[PDB]
Ligand binder design. Sequence first.
Ligand code: JRY
Lengths: 300, 300
Amino acid sequence: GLVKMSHPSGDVEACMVQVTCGSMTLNGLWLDNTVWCPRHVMCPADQLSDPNYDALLISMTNHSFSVQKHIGAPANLRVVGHAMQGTLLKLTVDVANPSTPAYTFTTVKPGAAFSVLACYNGRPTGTFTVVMRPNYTIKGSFLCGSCGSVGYTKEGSVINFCYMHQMELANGTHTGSAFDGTMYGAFMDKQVHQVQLTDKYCSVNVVAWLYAAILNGCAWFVKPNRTSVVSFNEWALANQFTEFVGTQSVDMLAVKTGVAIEQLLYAIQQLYTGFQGKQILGSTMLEDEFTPEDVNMQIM
Amino acid sequence: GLVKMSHPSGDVEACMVQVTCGSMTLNGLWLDNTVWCPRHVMCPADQLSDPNYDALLISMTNHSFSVQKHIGAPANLRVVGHAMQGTLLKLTVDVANPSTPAYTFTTVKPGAAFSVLACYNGRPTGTFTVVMRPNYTIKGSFLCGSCGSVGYTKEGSVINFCYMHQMELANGTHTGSAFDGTMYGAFMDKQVHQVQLTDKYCSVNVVAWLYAAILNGCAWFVKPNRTSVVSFNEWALANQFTEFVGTQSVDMLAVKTGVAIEQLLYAIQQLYTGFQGKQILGSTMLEDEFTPEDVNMQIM
Ligand SMILES: *C(=O)NCCCCCC
């Protein structure tokens, strides 16, 4: 039985700081001599309707930004430079984070999972895992003052930072930016109403879940009929599924079950219409929030 | 929305060590001058079926145990005392963990949630949240070598340690010790087949989940009809639900929504027989792993 699992957050906790600019405050991420944070910390509350972020960064002086580390030994960090990259601020501080881990900045693609450290005013409060939805939103739990919370994956000892939380959309859809500065789904960091695209099922994750079903004895849906990847993907554009892309992780499931990817792509086409009278792993809905890598590590 | 939220795990990560005795190795918890770990580390795998821990304790010296800390400040320690306490070893080491958090030991009750830091050979690898099941088991991801993994809650600055992982019973079903040394559910730490009681739905958590559904505009299941607590509890004995016991946490959700507890007790009796074709908060079955405290926190 699959469980939602996050990465241990300790390494990321040691990098969180609070960033304050005038009356606005939120979270930032302290790596080496750099503090990253969402640029809307520069924007007075009244002016969020549409801000001129270029006409905000010029107005910034040597001491417009204040940075505080709360966790570990409390410290104020003096800001010595300020630059803007996409929807993020890049602030230079005069002390390097002595607990900077080995890290990279990669953007995640829909269907992939990552861990989120939720913070409030530089203090970690909670951690969960999400998958990037095909409409480039995430289904998180973020309350007031959690902007700048950080999403990440980990391979070896290398932290891959992939998300910095920016805003809430509909009732609980959230989005943020990759650390190159680009907002996921080209949403705009303004208090303007923006429409999200329709969500879709993550096909590769549904496939992983059907492999987890087969591994737990649940395999009534497997039949010899096959749908090819290229055929499946043309079907998908019309039926609210993502394109399928294979990975070595999927292949390892197919090798251990003896069931081919193309059989499960056929099955998905049938199960979409309805499960008829049966269940799969206790569910009557398709499940798309577990990845091949999840199934591989948890049902080894 | 409703996300599976865990406590940030940095405080507990800095206390995980590897404990080795003979050919057996597993995880331990380093608090001040004490390292806690499951006592079956003393038992060679052959006599795991019927160990004599009192004899095994006599046959041991301080030199029978080695302890290493792998992550963070990589210091490794000398054992200067050893004792047994229920199903736990209590080793004394000559260095006080300088990263020890403020902490208590408390035993958790069925229905309650706590975070788990899954480790392997003293390296933290994942975190997730479980609830203590009515049959005094938990469902998580505990692969080979995760014995000694630790469960905890956090209140203010104080970590409350409540669980140290001991064994897998059936597939996916796990149990362990409180830090007073007693096994949850009185199971024996022996590779012997033992029978677990039947699991039940935690009624107070199901009710909180329906409240969360109402607060998110999913209320198709709410009727004027009511079942009293006294009468639901008799029904529960016959349908494998726990006794419903209200708390001020539950009362706040009833106040906020205007929907009485007794209306949701009636709805559970109806939804138990099947959701027909309908969904509640993504789900086609009742969810009982969200607590009223958890719902109050995430949804407010
Ligand atoms: C987070 O601190 N604030 C969210 C409001 C920002 C709206 C425009 C990006």
